[PDB]
From a paper:
Using X-ray crystallography, we show that the ciliopathy-associated centriolar protein [name] contains three C2 domains. [name], for example, plays a key role in the duplication, elongation, and maturation of centrioles, which in principle could impact the production of a functional basal body (Comartin et al., 2013, Lin et al., 2013, Mahjoub et al., 2010, Wu et al., 2014). All three C2 domains of [name] ([name], C2B, and C2C) adopt the PLC δ1-like topology II and are structurally similar to each other (root-mean-square deviation [RMSD], 2.4–2.6 Å), with major differences found mainly in their loop length. Thus, the [name] C2 domains probably play a role as protein-protein interaction modules.
While the [name] domain of [name] interacts with tubulin and promotes microtubule formation (Lin et al., 2013, Sharma et al., 2018), our results suggest that the C2B domain does not directly contribute to this activity, as neither JS nor JATD mutations in C2B abolished the ability of [name] to cause centriole overextension when overexpressed in cells. Our structures revealed neither complexed Ca2+ nor potential Ca2+-coordinating top loop residues or cationic β-grooves.
Author numbering: -2 to 134
Amino acid sequence: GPHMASKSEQLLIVVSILEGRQFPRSPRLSLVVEARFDGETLSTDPVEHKEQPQFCTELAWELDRRTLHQHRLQRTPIKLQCYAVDSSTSARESVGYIVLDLRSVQEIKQAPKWHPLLSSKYTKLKPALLIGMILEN
C-alpha cells in the first residue's frame, strides 16, 4: 500500500576499545575514549594514563540490517576522541581522534587493529588505540 512497513534483523555493532600504546606516562592524569555514532555518544570510564593504557571497554549500538546497509553506503563514521582528564582541576583535553567506518563490519569477524590518534597532542612517538569492531548476532 501507500504506506509500507519495513522489517530487517536487529543487530548490535560492538566497538572494543582494547588498549593504547605510545602514550606518555602521566600519573596525574587519566584517559577516556568517547565514541559517537549517528548522534549517540558512549564513553569509557577513566583509566590510568599509562604508556599502554588498558581501556578494556566494549561500546555497543543497536540498529537493524537495513539501516546498517544505509550507513555503509553513506560511510557514516564512528567518531572516537581520546581525552586526557585531570581530576585535580576537573579538566580534560582532547589528545587525538580516530574515525572508523562500518563498510566492512560483518558477522564474519575481523581481528582488532591499531589505529594511530590523528592530530595528536603527544607528538613524540605515535599514540594509538587497539580497536575491534564486530556485528553481534
